[PDB]
Amino acid sequence: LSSSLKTCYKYLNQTSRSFAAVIQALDGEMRNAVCIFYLVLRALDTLEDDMTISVEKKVPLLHNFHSFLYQPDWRFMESKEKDRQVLEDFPTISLEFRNLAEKYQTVIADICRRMGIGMAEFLDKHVTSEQEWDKYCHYVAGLVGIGLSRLFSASEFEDPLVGEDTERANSMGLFLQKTNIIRDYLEDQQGGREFWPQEVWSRYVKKLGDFAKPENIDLAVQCLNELITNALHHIPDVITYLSRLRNQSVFNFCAIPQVMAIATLAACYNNQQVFKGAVKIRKGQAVTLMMDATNMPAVKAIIYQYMEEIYHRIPDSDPSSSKTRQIISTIRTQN
Numbered sequence: 001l002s003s004s005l006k007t008c009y010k011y012l013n014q015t016s017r018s019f020a021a022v023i024q025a026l027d028g029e030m031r032n033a034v035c036i037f038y039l040v041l042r043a044l045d046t047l048e049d050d051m052t053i054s055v056e057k058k059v060p061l062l063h064n065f066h067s068f069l070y071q072p073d074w075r076f077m078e079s080k081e082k083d084r085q086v087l088e089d090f091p092t093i094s095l096e097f098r099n100l101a102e103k104y105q106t107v108i109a110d111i112c113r114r115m116g117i118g119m120a121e122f123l124d125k126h127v128t129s130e131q132e133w134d135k136y137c138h139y140v141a142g143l144v145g146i147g148l149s150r151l152f153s154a155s156e157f158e159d160p161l162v163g164e165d166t167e168r169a170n171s172m173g174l175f176l177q178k179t180n181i182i183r184d185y186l187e188d189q190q191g192g193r194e195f196w197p198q199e200v201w202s203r204y205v206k207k208l209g210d211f212a213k214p215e216n217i218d219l220a221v222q223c224l225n226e227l228i229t230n231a232l233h234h235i236p237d238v239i240t241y242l243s244r245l246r247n248q249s250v251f252n253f254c255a256i257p258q259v260m261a262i263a264t265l266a267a268c269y270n271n272q273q274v275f276k277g278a279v280k281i282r283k284g285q286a287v288t289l290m291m292d293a294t295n296m297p298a299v300k301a302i303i304y305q306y307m308e309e310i311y312h313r314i315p316d317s318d319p320s321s322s323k324t325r326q327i328i329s330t331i332r333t334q335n
């Protein structure tokens with residue numbers, strides 16, 4: 001390995017932690033192509049996230065990010081974010097980008113271009129409708145699922161349908177993203193960020209921050225349950241997506257985050273703690289899920305068990321209760 005690729009893998013371990021090993025297990029050319037795509041997305045995200053960067057400066061950065069991949073000397077030195085290293089040493093990452101086969105370069109660059117356009121569109125605004133929530137999620141997460149899918153097909157380890165079915169790929173990203181947004185309500189609040197859609201929360205309270213106040217906890221949990229019900233709608237696509245994967249290392253790569261999100265939604269369902277702190281999967285729980293998620297029958301079993309759990313916990317007066325029951329029944333009767 002070149003020294004620049006070794007630095008890339010060190011950044012991957014710093015950023016993706018226990019998940020780095022799963023990326024490192026990808027077969028053949030998929031390994032480096034995913035590692036670089038991961039780091040490049042980490043850099044894009046770090047620009048997006050950084051509230052110290054003015055909108056005037058951020059819009060060009062987001063729009064032009066795809067171009068920076070091709071600019072050997074391009075770097076960014078003024079990020080105050082946690083993963084600022086991937087921006088300060090972007091030349092190391094971009095060099096390795098430009099060492100990839102062109103069929104992978106072109107995927108990554110197109111995705112970065114489209115994601116940057118969409119991230120720049122949401123700088124001013126908060127998410128209003130459920131449709132806008134899916135648009136925002138497409139830009140920051142659905143397009144990641146689409147890009148990855150295209151690397152798998154372009155590498156020929158998976159059938160072309162995997163790369164072409166953008167809707168199923170998009171759902172893979174939306175499932176994770178909505179789960180993260182649902183779970184991270186409070187830390188986002190404290191960070192001054194709002195991602196829960198205004199059209200759902202405004203039916204319960206006057207301001208999104210009101211869910212942190214004790215007197216509104218019942219209303220908060222109802223909205224939580226409603227948003228969780230929303231996220232569960234992606235699971236049929238997730239099952240379809242995963243069912244098509246023929247390469248073991250790709251399967252594990254794609255399946256592990258999905259079953260972690262399933263378990264996360266089940267922990268968060270009807271859970272007041274979402275509003276008081278960070279609800280997390282026990283490490284031992286996470287490890288077993290990661291070890292088990294290696295074939296369709298096992299992943300389906302895991303989905304069904306957690307959905308049955310949610311199902312038995314649905315409160316009769318929950319405002320979404322029949323919607324929750326219906327999507328769980330749909331999921332259960334597919335495979």
Ligand SMILES: COc1ccccc1[C@H]1OCCCN(C(=O)N2CCC(CC(=O)O)CC2)CC(=O)N(CC(C)(C)C)c2ccc(Cl)cc21
Pocket residue numbers: 015016017018019034037038041140141144145148172173176177253254257
């Ligand atoms: C669409 O997403 C897919 C699709 C297929 C496969 C993988 C992903 C996804 O990875 C999920 C697991 C790793 N993620 C992560 O950062 N960690 C942090 C450390 C944690 C473990 C730990 O702390 O030890 C695990 C979770 C990255 C991530 O969440 N996303 C998903 C979105 C874009 C919603 C944020 C991500 C980003 C880039 C790529 Cl290339 C993949 C992904």
